[PDB]
Design a protein around this ligand. Sequence first.
Ligand code: HEM
Ligand SMILES: O=N[O-]
Length: 152
Amino acid sequence: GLSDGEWQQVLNVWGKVEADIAGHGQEVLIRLFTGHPETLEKFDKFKHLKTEAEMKASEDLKKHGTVVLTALGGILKKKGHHEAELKPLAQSHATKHKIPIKYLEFISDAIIHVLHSKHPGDFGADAQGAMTKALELFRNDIAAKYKELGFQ
Ligand code: HEM
Ligand SMILES: O=N[O-]
């Protein structure tokens, strides 16, 4: 957990994201914000987005989607050896942004949804298993840092 085979699947799936990082990033955030409107309130810069149409037309939302998925991609390519990459994000998200770990669960689920939505029939059962494991590992390691900091 994860096996070499599983990491290979994760990084193969990630190639899909890398072909259109901004599009995937945008759809992940829109899925997050529409499914869980409380998450929007954590972003002073997105609180004005009162409709999905406005979300889709927001170039800054797309920009942030790129920032988020680029960060995640860098972490995934470490294949679990990600302490240095993950540390600042756990600290900024717990201490500055005040993001409950529950919201990281939400965004993880959103990634899985968007992969199926954008690649229906091309995100196989093995691939979903591997990507889910990778996102759980990410969450688990963030959670350990949150506990250190006494957040939530
Ligand atoms: C895959 C999980 C996530 C990744 C990789 C990620 C990554 C990032 C990065 C790289 C930044 C800019 C640098 C920083 O402040 O640390 C950032 C900022 C931020 N993130 Fe996340 N994030 C994730 C999940 C979330 C979630 C679920 C929320 C809220 C529901 C959130 C809220 C924020 C906020 C409010 C900012 C500051 C925005 C600004 O001031 O421009 N993040 N995130
Ligand atoms: O959109 N997560 O920073």
